[PDB]
Amino acid sequence: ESEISQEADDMAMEKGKYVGELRKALLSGAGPADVYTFNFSKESCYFF
Amino acid sequence: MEELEQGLLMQPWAWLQLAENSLLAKVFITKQGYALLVSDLQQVWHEQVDTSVVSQRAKELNKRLTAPPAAFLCHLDNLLRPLLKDATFSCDCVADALILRVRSELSGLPFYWNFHCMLASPSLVSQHLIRPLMGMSLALQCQVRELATLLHMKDLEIQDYQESGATLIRDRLKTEPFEENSFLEQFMIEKLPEACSIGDGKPFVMNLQDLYMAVTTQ
Amino acid sequence: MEELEQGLLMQPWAWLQLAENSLLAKVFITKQGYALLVSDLQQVWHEQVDTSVVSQRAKELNKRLTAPPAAFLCHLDNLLRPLLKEATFSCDCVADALILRVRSELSGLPFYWNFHCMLASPSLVSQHLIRPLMGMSLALQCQVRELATLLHMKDLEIQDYQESGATLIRDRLKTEPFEENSFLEQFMIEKLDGKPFVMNLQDLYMAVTTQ
Known part of the structure; x- marks a missing residue:
């Protein structure tokens, strides 16, 4: 409940x-022309 | 010091893309930062803060500075286009405090940022914001008068050509020589109401700005 | 709101004859207080306050001499009468402790007077006055364009003056075809303090400052 509330009240999207940013950043929806540095820190166990 | 005014007055007089107002505001891209300078001789609202004071106000007074000043310097440096290619600057003129909310948005999610019009620097403004009057006078109000005199000697050449032959024949070109006093009187009495051209500053971006840069070059 | 400043703006600017600086000051003291608008192009004295400062000046030096405010306003009106055809103020080259000195020899014993001055506000030179100056600049640009068009059509009529003309020509004044590059070059390269500003624009400023 707190996570949903903060998602609603922090980024403030109405x-x-x-949606397009979610599709391109998360699902690699952009064309194979721009490389996305989605490097997951294996040593830190932190995905930023 | 002796570089912000020299590197800032050269900004062409370009209208900032406000949604409602049509104010005259210019700022030039400077590697050391930026300082919005306005000159109208009655009351200053110019953003200029010392590095130290904004440093303390960011360290222990402002907690929203989640972006280093290097990012702001990089954005300022990598902005070659003065005019928008198509980040609209909206204003809410509802009270005295004109809070021009500059929505810092590069591409996608609009970063949250706002301005504040505090007091300007006394020495620099008092020393360099009175020059434009004399710079306009000495240059423009001499060049224009010399253009008028050149017209006067052209009229003299026309009239002593006429008195030495080459008498004008057709009525289409039959025009009297120009007089400054008569032109001023007829402007005041007949065409002054119809010559009032302010609007949104049509010559402000096509003739006023370049000639003013010529004026403010020195 | 607008009445006082509208009435005062019609009043012509009075340059003080001190021969050491430029003073662009407006004076109109008839009623509704006194409009002693003293400005040295860097700090305008918005001396539109009520009789408080006048009374304190008149009483803190004169413990046995009093004059009515009507006499004060009459004297203020009569102050600058023999100057618009002396009431001269002299500044100094000293640090921020600006103390004006009046050493006129009138009775043998020097007369003492203090000129109260507040801090100069750096937020006093960017709001209004250039907008009428931008209007005057627009009028000047319109005049320049009209004169240029007149020059062009007179040049075209001069083009008619070689086939029906051929008058006495010194041969050193032939009219070449008009070229914009040469025109701009001659307008730019060749024919490109404060005192010249005022003594060149005091007459011209009253022309368009109304409408």
Whole structure:
């Protein structure tokens, strides 16, 4: 409940443009022209 | 010191993309930062803060500075286009405190940032924000008068050509020589109401700005 | 709101004859207080306050001499009458402790007077006055364009003056075809303190400052 509340109240998205960003950043929806440095820190166990 | 005004007055008079107002505001890209300078001779609202004071206000007074000043310097440096390619600057003119919320947005999620119009620096403004009057006078109000005199000697050449032959024939070109006093009087009495051209500053971006840079070059 | 400043702006600027600086000051003291608008191009004295400062100046030096405010305003109106055809103020080259000195020899014993001055506000030179100056600049640009068009059409009529003309020509004044590059070069390269500003624009400023 706290996570949903903070997701709703922090980023403050009401009819925004984050769906495309989610599709490109998370699912690698962008074309194979721009490399995305989604490096997961294996030693730190931290995904930023 | 002796570099911000020299590296800032050279900014072409370009209208900032405000949604409602049509104020005259110019700022030039400077490697040392930026300082919005406005000159109208009655009351200053210019953003200029010492590095130290903003340093303490960021270390122990502002907790929202989640982006290093290097990012701001990089964004300032990598901005070659003055005019927007198509980041709209919106203002809410509802009270005296004109809070021009500069929404820092590069591409995608708009980063949260805002400005504040505090007091400007006394020495620099008092020393370099009175020059534009004399710079306009000495240069422009002499060049224009010399253009008028050149027209006067052209009229003299026309009239003593006429008095030495080459008498004008057709009525289409039959025009009297120009007089400055008569032109001023007819402007005041007949075409002054219809010559009032302010609007949104049409010549401000096509003729006023370049000639003003020519004026403010010295 | 607008009445006082609108009335005062119509009043012509009075340059003080001190021969050491430029003073752009407005004076109109008839009613509704006194408009002693003293400005040295860097700090305008918004001396539109009520009789408080006048009374304190008149009483802190004169413990046995009193004059009515009507006499004060009449004297203020009569102050600058024989100057618009002396009431001269002299500054100094000393540090921020600006103390004006009046050493005129009138009775043998020097007369003492203090000129109260507050801190100069750095937020006093960016709001209004250039907007009418931008209007005057626009009028000047319109005049320049009109004169250039007149020059162009007169040049075209001169083009008619070689086939029906051929008058006495010194041969050192032939009219070449008009070229914009040469025109701009001659307008730019060749024909490109404060005192010249005021003694060149005092007459011209009243022309368009109204409308």
